Symmetry: none
Subunit: 139 residues, 10 copies
């Protein structure tokens, strides 16, 4: 069952990003805090939509896609990925990682249903690395 | 009005990009027409130094985020 | 059946050669236009008699003979020439190419009867190359600079014209055009080409890149 | 049997390109007019040699090659191309499209002999698209 | 001291590069830290004309030799 | 009259050749006698600078077109 | 067994590079001389460290890496490389070419032990090509004219020097040298070359002809 | 096994040619000295590349080709050439003399492998005569 | 003495050739050394106009008769 | 048996050439007169040595050689030459025409012995044509 993040925590994090900036160690610590439980693509996408401005959000979408593509290359380079399965029918496509696959587009409940925990942690680590890249790039 | 937005002589590029993306997304355009308009406004507005910086891009920039990243990398520090 | 070229087109082409000269690209385009269908030796001979003066006509007769001789050497070097046949009885002599063979002298109908289409196209290409030689002879790429006020497309047009209408081999024109774009074309465009993140290996690609990133002024 | 285009029409089209430019709608209409019947590589090549200047002609050769390469990729992606045949012996190489194949170099009669109507229409559409690209690029 | 080396207003770029590489390689840095330091000193020293020349590099330069070659190609002849 | 044609002191060579070939081909000579006459008139008319230029030809010129080409190549630009 | 190159030869070569430069034909000849026997990566690396300055050495390391990568691409494109073997266990990695593999780092004896002669000659040719690239890069032919008082052999020397020490491809130097002999080389020699009863198709032949028939003065 | 000439001797010979010229008797004596052992086409070619300037090198290539052609005419005029063999399969082509034959282009080791001693001495004498011609021609 | 014979400033070429061939054939030279000497005396004597005329000979002249014919053909009529 | 021409006739012809020149019709008539009987190479050679100066004699030697070479080309183009024979062993070499063959050098008696009448008339006609060429060339 999907539970959304508190809008109070999200508002506090947005104001933190607004006053301290993207690169302060306190901001990265707060992001790591709100990045503790494995989030669904819907959660991370809306979180970055709210806390980041328009141009940093575009940059972050780009960087997140690139990092997820690196993850999928490593996944096709190793059939023992915690997102993959043993047979070929469990291979994870980027539509399933970005939340674009069938039964997931716009629906967080179905998303949480079909996604694997390894998928969730890989998406989360990818999003964190992308946030780091964009923060280092913006300023 | 988005089509009246120019980058001021003293304005930085991130402020201009913020203002332009705000005015384009908060307008009457369809959702599928915002990215091309933002790109073509980056190319024709954004005073001729950045215009030439975007023009002479060895790579093809096909997204507002990529254009912003490229310009922020190669901008004239001043 | 032989059909003559219109004297109206020939008169217009003659006046074009009279005003623009022999070497202008418009004149060469007009000649290529009137050189579209394969012409009989009679047609090309009368055409050059009318459009060219006496001395250029003598030069053109010389050059046409030389080019036809090169063609006949290539023909005796390959029995599969579209003018030749398989047996030795179809070998094409210069009397048949210049229209001097038996049954052809002065008669365009008999000419059109006995001539092959490969013969016609070879004669036509030979005459075109001879016209190019004489035009280059009757009236320098390494002296071309882009003027301070000249645009880049005009400079590129002038340079490509002078390089292709010169004595260089065909396989040496593209590298020369590129290296002349790089060293001529005043230092703003020189630096624009130098700082190209991609490698430009064709005059068209260089022209496209420069037209994209040029300083609008 | 090959019939050349009238030098009168070609002269009028060249003067149209000279006065109106490459991008005017009247010029594109005139080109579409002279691009009505499927032309052999010889015809289109000489036409562009006459109507275009040296630098636009170089650009057009480049663009025509690129578009023909895209066509040949689509052809190897579908064995039912009107230029292709059913067996592998009818596969169309770029030497046959650009007029560089055996029995075609410099000879328009042999060209018209060996070429297919699908080949001709594909070459013609490729040349038209290349002309559009170069016209959009020159000015 | 390598961190005090600046390209003089009248000095050429090859002399500055020679002096900088000399002072960086003949110093107390580890061997695996010389190339990044030389690059980042090319980028921040080397007076703002060459700074902007390196900044607006359509390609990514990841070696002191490549940076030197690029700058020598596109330098302002004077 | 072809035998009265001289190259004027100020006249160019292509004009003289045009005039001479015109007068020789539009005359009462047989067709097989025009080329030798045109050559021998190039050699004896065509004021002594071009006369010496044709005389000192390392190659043998046996056609009016070849003589015209040679003279146009090696003529005194003035 | 590994034998080092003489420091006397290396000192002489370093002083040659110091006085004549990187691009002089004498310097390239000396490098070819000291590049005669197949050298181990240690030898070539130390040689370039000694004879080249710091910045040319960085450029040369870059170029050598790129050329070795092209070699390894050709090697994976052909299992019959003299550096490769027949089985997959003899495939040559860049760590083995650059001397970075196991048992080779810093030790020339072990290097000479494990390396193949094909490996050595490939490394050597790669290093030579990289040296050529860097020499062409570290330091204008179309601006060269024969002065009114200059002799022809001096003009030919200067022109051939500037054309061969430039950015042209190797297959484009002879036609450019010929066409520069024809258009430069003030109009007396221009007419001397123009009126050549034979066709001159080589810079050496043109030089010989002009030296024979030149106006002694 | 191929052994290269010393670059020290080559440098000294190049400076001799630079100061004394091509035609001095001391220069010809030095060339005869460095022309003592039969050289492979690679050796003589690189030697003339280093000691001669560009234009004398072009002249020398021409003269060397002409002299080698005279040698090959004498060889087809006598089947007992020390470069030839008794059967027709040992006839020596100019590609083998100029080092252009198969297995020799750019490789001095293979060159030294396939070449005959008579071939080497004929190439060497031809190169010496060509050097004499070019020296008499240059000044 | 043959080695003292020069073509005078006003002397024609056939007179000079006659005098030179006379003095060379009526001398103490071997019979096999007369033609090369006559040629090399035509080339070095025979005042610099004819010297340059013989020098710029597109063909190679290997006989005194051929040199005489060539010079008589291409000589400056005066 | 060889009989020499009278030195009186030769002296008169030499003085005729000296006063009238080489090209006068009387001189050509006198030469035709002394060219009536077929002469041996020795006779014509000495005759031209006496009547012609040194430079015209060199020119005449050149022209005579060229004309004899044309004759020998026509002879190898037709095995029915009055100088040739039917078999290949009677083919006439230029050494036999110029009097340079074996048993003829300097000896007019042996010359007259081995030479054919067709050889003599061909040599004579060649010498007459060469004299005409040189006379037209000298003045």
């Amino acid at each position: 069952a999907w539970t959304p993040l508190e809008p109070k925590l999200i508002t506090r994090l947005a104001d933190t990003v607004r006053t301290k900036g993207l690169r302060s160690p306190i901001t990265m610590a707060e992001v790591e805090a709100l990045m503790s439980s494995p989030l669904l693509p819907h959660d991370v996408t809306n979180l970055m939509r709210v806390i980041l401005g328009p141009a940093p959000y575009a940059l972050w979408m780009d960087a997140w896609g690139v990092q997820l593509q690196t993850v999928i290359a490593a996944a096709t380079r190793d059939p023992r990925h915690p997102a993959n399965g043993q047979g070929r029918g469990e291979r994870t496509n980027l539509n399933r990682l970005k939340g674009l696959a069938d039964g997931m587009v716009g629906n967080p409940q179905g998303q949480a249903a079909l996604l694997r925990p390894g998928e969730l942690v890989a998406i989360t680590a990818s999003a964190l690395q992308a946030f780091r890249e964009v923060a280092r790039l913006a300023e």
